[PDB]
Amino acid sequence: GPLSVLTQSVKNNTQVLINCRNNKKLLGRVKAFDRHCNMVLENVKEMWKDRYISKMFLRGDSVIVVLR
Amino acid sequence: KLVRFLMKLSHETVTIELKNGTQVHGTITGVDVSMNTHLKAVKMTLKNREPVQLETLSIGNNIRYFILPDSLPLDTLL
Amino acid sequence: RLWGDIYFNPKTRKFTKKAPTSSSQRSFVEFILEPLYKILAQVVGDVDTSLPRTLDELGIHLTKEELKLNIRPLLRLVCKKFFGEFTGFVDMCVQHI
Amino acid sequence: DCLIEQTHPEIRKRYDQDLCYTDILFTEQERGVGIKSTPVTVVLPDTKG
Amino acid sequence: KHAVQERLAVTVCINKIDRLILELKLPPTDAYYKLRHIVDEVNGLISMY
Amino acid sequence: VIEPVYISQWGSMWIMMRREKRDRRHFKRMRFPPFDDEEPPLDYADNILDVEPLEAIQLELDPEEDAPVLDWFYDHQPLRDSRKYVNGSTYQRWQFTLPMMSTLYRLANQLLTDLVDDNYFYLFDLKAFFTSKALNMAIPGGPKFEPLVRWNEFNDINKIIIRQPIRTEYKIAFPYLYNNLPHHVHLTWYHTPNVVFIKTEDPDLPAFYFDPLINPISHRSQEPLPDDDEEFELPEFVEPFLKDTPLYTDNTANGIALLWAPRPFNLRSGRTRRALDIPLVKNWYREHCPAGQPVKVRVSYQKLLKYYVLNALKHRPPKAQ
Amino acid sequence: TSVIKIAVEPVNPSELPKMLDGLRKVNKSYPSLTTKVEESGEHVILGTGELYLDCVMHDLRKMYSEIDIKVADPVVTFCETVVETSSLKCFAETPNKKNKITMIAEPLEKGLAEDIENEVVQITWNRKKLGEFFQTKYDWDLLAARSIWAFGPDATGPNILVDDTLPSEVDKALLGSVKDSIVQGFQWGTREGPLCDELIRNVKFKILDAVVAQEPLHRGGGQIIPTARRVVYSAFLMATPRLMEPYYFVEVQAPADCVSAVYTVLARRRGHVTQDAPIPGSPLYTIKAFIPAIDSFGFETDLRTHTQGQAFSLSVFHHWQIVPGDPLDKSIVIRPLEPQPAPHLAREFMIKTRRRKGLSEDVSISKF
Amino acid sequence: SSKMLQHIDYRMRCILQDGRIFIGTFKAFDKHMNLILCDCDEFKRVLGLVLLRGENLVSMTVEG
RNA sequence: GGUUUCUCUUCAGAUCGCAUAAAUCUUUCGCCUUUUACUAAAGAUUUCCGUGGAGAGGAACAAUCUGAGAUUUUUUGAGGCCUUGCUUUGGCAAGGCU
């Protein structure tokens, strides 16, 4: 709820790092969330070396943890 | 919200990575309300092998990550 | 199933090509035209008696100053709130042009 | 005019008289008839968004 | 006739349906009959052209 | 005053004046001056303060048909004490309801026009009269003005084909086409779509009903229908949106008639105007004069139109001050 | 088709080029607008209707030019046609007096001009396909069906060139060598027009003889075309020509009580009601009628005036008919301002158009 | 529930959740992505008509 | 997070007014001995009868009122395990397992 809105505000104001369940940590500006925990992030570098991507949409089933 | 952006970006060529390590890059033709999508001219890279050209590839929710194109403004769908 | 002499049976809840009873309207009349008639009749005739009940049945909420408008801009506002943005014309030009 | 008012938020039709966005010539305003065809480039959503 | 002869896709919208309701006060079955008559006339004109 | 209440009150006045002149055997004018030049002015307290006044004109209303205006129709300030109708005792803004608006529209029937659109005023409106003044040419129904401004081979008689003469009306309707030197000319409004509105007489008929004045449709090659009962039965608790709502009420035809009412009667709310600023008879001379009238009243119609056009032409927006 | 013709003049002649610049400006701003300069020096604007030309003239007077401008009365542009065949087998010859062209002109059938103008048949078709198209529905001979050379004043124009030469088929290679120059002579002759400098329509030009000089070269290198123009004009003049007047199709939407009043307006303007019908689902009526285009000036204004603005009409170009008079009757006297009756109409239109642009006298044997 | 219309009659190559790859002509599919395909040739074996569940099909590609 | 009413200040570019008067000046007319008072058109300005928005102060009434606010296919367990190179010691890349 409001904690997800605060996390989206932190990801708009800074870079949020999310570690998925597929052993990949992606750091970048997360733009949108979802009710099924799907995350849409802009300019995200995912390390699993860090590879850069412009826009990445990930389903919430493969997500594990996230932080600012 | 994210499904709305995925349906809105269903014209340009995008790259979708499955949970099995298969990555397919091609032009999205139709994306449903679920994660099932259809792609054309897909230069699908095999799992630690060479890529192949597929005319029409249909993917349940087996896709883990999808690389959306750069056509995404701050208020295109927000 | 809407347009073109298809009738609706609420007992079987099914759309048939044959009218089930006499004086039974078609699906386009009963499902599309008659609620439009009832919406415009409730606006232009019953703006103060049964209009907020009718707007509550449609899930449309209006402010106090919006109900003080004259009949043509209020009806325009009610139809804009009900039908929303213009999407059928856009879908026509997508799947037919 | 309806498509413009759907797209443009601060452009609103007046209550008494009809707005006419594409009729930009004053001859079309005084005559009340379309004279010259006008193009409009707009971005519109469908039912699927 | 000109749109058929220019080889373009043709779609039809029926504007001013409120004139069937507020202005003419038709019953809704007769409004359906008028709309179907309009559609049949346009289809007959296209099939003739 | 509220403008529809004022117009309805004067329409009721018009009805009782016509009835009184029809029914009285000998109407007698009061003499002028009522008092002599040496008769002193009467004291109010000695003569007028302690006598009961006589009756007013006051058209009696039907308690059934004219119910929602029956209580307050003949007050000085009609609904000033009420709060849900007027804004207060400064009596500035008014909000009314549609049944009593239809009652006022019925009561003001004698002083109102029968037209539903401006297509009656084709070459008989303000822009046409401005063009007519600027060209120094006039329709015989319209007014006349002073001139504003005061060899050609196009006027050669051996090069001009005449089948129909170029009249005044074509020089007004298309003024840049048929006039050399057009100056200070206003383009008239073109055709407006015809308001095909059917007036119902009896309230026993339904509000949505095929009138005999409308021509029948008489509808007389396959449709892309789906398969009959193959699939797609409707789920439970789905319905048309307003199934419990009736199609039409008793106020529906009155509201539909109020949609195409004249200018003060197609409103739910408005601002009160001064009693000087309401011309009750402007629509009478803004239309054409009826046939069979004598010369004197047609000249009166022309002069009223001339004064109206001269008021509209010289009008400027007011300054700040 | 833009058929309404309006002459335009500046008030001060010293401001003559300025409005000319504005004329170029209105030619930039209207697609179907045609501006011509005649031999008389006047400038001619062609339009489709009264409202269209009113908008053009308002834009000329207020936007692209500040010059006060005189406007003439509106007229139409006519065409030229024939009724009966060439009674005399007329002919002409080259300035190098070896080639001799003999050709006669006769009118076409009913559907042929509208079949050519709607591009049902083209010159890019197969010769056998074109011959089958003529033979199945026009019952032409196959010799005549293979005889068709060229069309009209332009591509898909409503005139047909047919070559039927039996003694000149022995040098038909040389006939095909001069065929192209015969074609441009035919195009120029049907584009210009000898009667009142208007277009020629619904004529079949049938060649009878072609005495071509053997290997002409020096004489067959440009002298063929004005010879062919004189042949076309002389064959046209010997076949009782007529003026060919445009007609408008008018649809009127009216209330039921005003309909007969609409008839009255057509009674003053040489019109006739094609079809009166009630509109289904509406309390109005549709009156479809045909009017002459000359009598159509201010028809809408008179219709709205006589019906208190209730009846409204729209009008568009439909087709052409023949003027009831004869254009070449010298015995017809023309009153200078009286509206002429029906047998004097073509003579009046002829005389006034020729006084408008060209020479007053017309000679039937002016070429040969 | 929408991909069955475009591949109603054409043969397709299917990839199951066990890593198996098959080729066969699909006939009909259910609303829960349970697709029935005839002549499903295993890649080397032949199985004929077989129905696959929605969670079984990891990916699909159009063969015919 | 009240209404009504009174007064003052400021801004009006909306048909500020779904109504419409008068005056001054400069010219053209008409009447015409001359001057007011006049005729009726244009242009440039003003006055008057009214109006809208915002702010401030006062008085009388309700004293609140009006708001915003889990397993059964595709969003949760098919989860663990040995070997090869790196070990970047949290594991990655490859095989049969269950």
From Swiss-Prot, chain A:
GO terms for molecular function: RNA binding. Residues 3-68 form the Sm domain. The keyword Transport does not apply. It is found in: Cytoplasm, Cytosol; Nucleus. Keywords: Acetylation, Cytoplasm, Isopeptide bond, mRNA processing, mRNA splicing, Nucleus, Phosphoprotein, Ribonucleoprotein, Spliceosome, Ubl conjugation. The keyword Nucleus applies. One of its GO terms (cellular component) is nucleoplasm. One of its GO terms (biological process) is 7-methylguanosine cap hypermethylation. It comes from the Eukaryota. In the autoimmune disease systemic lupus erythematosus, antinuclear antibodies are developed with Sm specificity. Core component of the spliceosomal U1, U2, U4 and U5 small nuclear ribonucleoproteins (snRNPs), the building blocks of the spliceosome. Most spliceosomal snRNPs contain a common set of Sm proteins, SNRPB, SNRPD1, SNRPD2, SNRPD3, SNRPE, SNRPF and SNRPG that assemble in a heptameric protein ring on the Sm site of the small nuclear RNA to form the core snRNP. Component of the U1 snRNP. The U1 snRNP is composed of the U1 snRNA and the 7 core Sm proteins SNRPB, SNRPD1, SNRPD2, SNRPD3, SNRPE, SNRPF and SNRPG, and at least three U1 snRNP-specific proteins SNRNP70/U1-70K, SNRPA/U1-A and SNRPC/U1-C. Belongs to the snRNP core protein family. This is Small nuclear ribonucleoprotein Sm D2. The gene is SNRPD2.
Curated annotation (Swiss-Prot), chain D:
This is 116 kDa U5 small nuclear ribonucleoprotein component. The chain holds residues 147 to 195 of 972 of the full protein. Required for pre-mRNA splicing as component of the spliceosome, including pre-catalytic, catalytic and post-catalytic spliceosomal complexes. Component of the U5 snRNP and the U4/U6-U5 tri-snRNP complex, a building block of the spliceosome. As a component of the minor spliceosome, involved in the splicing of U12-type introns in pre-mRNAs. It is linked to Mandibulofacial dysostosis with microcephaly: A rare syndrome characterized by progressive microcephaly, midface and malar hypoplasia, micrognathia, microtia, dysplastic ears, preauricular skin tags, significant developmental delay, and speech delay. Many patients have major sequelae, including choanal atresia that results in respiratory difficulties, conductive hearing loss, and cleft palate. It is found in: Nucleus. Belongs to the TRAFAC class translation factor GTPase superfamily. Classic translation factor GTPase family. EF-G/EF-2 subfamily. The lineage of its organism: Eukaryota, Metazoa, Chordata, Craniata, Vertebrata.
UniProtKB/Swiss-Prot annotation, chain F:
This is Pre-mRNA-processing-splicing factor 8. The chain holds residues 135 to 467 of 2335 of the full protein. It is found in: Nucleus; Nucleus speckle. Part of the U5 snRNP complex. Component of the U4/U6-U5 tri-snRNP complex composed of the U4, U6 and U5 snRNAs and at least PRPF3, PRPF4, PRPF6, PRPF8, PRPF31, SNRNP200, TXNL4A, SNRNP40, DDX23, CD2BP2, PPIH, SNU13, EFTUD2, SART1 and USP39. Component of the U5.U4atac/U6atac snRNP complexes in U12-dependent spliceosomes. Within the minor spliceosome, which acts on U12-type introns, interacts with PPIL2 and RBM48. Core component of U2-type precatalytic, catalytic and postcatalytic spliceosomal complexes. Found in a mRNA splicing-dependent exon junction complex (EJC) with SRRM1. Widely expressed. It is linked to Retinitis pigmentosa 13: A retinal dystrophy belonging to the group of pigmentary retinopathies. Retinitis pigmentosa is characterized by retinal pigment deposits visible on fundus examination and primary loss of rod photoreceptor cells followed by secondary loss of cone photoreceptors. Patients typically have night vision blindness and loss of midperipheral visual field. As their condition progresses, they lose their far peripheral visual field and eventually central vision as well.
UniProtKB/Swiss-Prot annotation, chain H:
It is found in: Cytoplasm, Cytosol; Nucleus. Methylated by PRMT5. Residues 1-64 form the Sm domain. Plays a role in pre-mRNA splicing as a core component of the spliceosomal U1, U2, U4 and U5 small nuclear ribonucleoproteins (snRNPs), the building blocks of the spliceosome. Component of both the pre-catalytic spliceosome B complex and activated spliceosome C complexes. As a component of the minor spliceosome, involved in the splicing of U12-type introns in pre-mRNAs. As part of the U7 snRNP it is involved in histone pre-mRNA 3'-end processing. Core component of the spliceosomal U1, U2, U4 and U5 small nuclear ribonucleoproteins (snRNPs), the building blocks of the spliceosome. Most spliceosomal snRNPs contain a common set of Sm proteins, SNRPB, SNRPD1, SNRPD2, SNRPD3, SNRPE, SNRPF and SNRPG that assemble in a heptameric protein ring on the Sm site of the small nuclear RNA to form the core snRNP. Component of the U1 snRNP. The U1 snRNP is composed of the U1 snRNA and the 7 core Sm proteins SNRPB, SNRPD1, SNRPD2, SNRPD3, SNRPE, SNRPF and SNRPG, and at least three U1 snRNP-specific proteins SNRNP70/U1-70K, SNRPA/U1-A and SNRPC/U1-C. Belongs to the snRNP SmB/SmN family. This is Small nuclear ribonucleoprotein-associated proteins B and B'. It comes from Homo sapiens (Human). The gene is SNRPB.
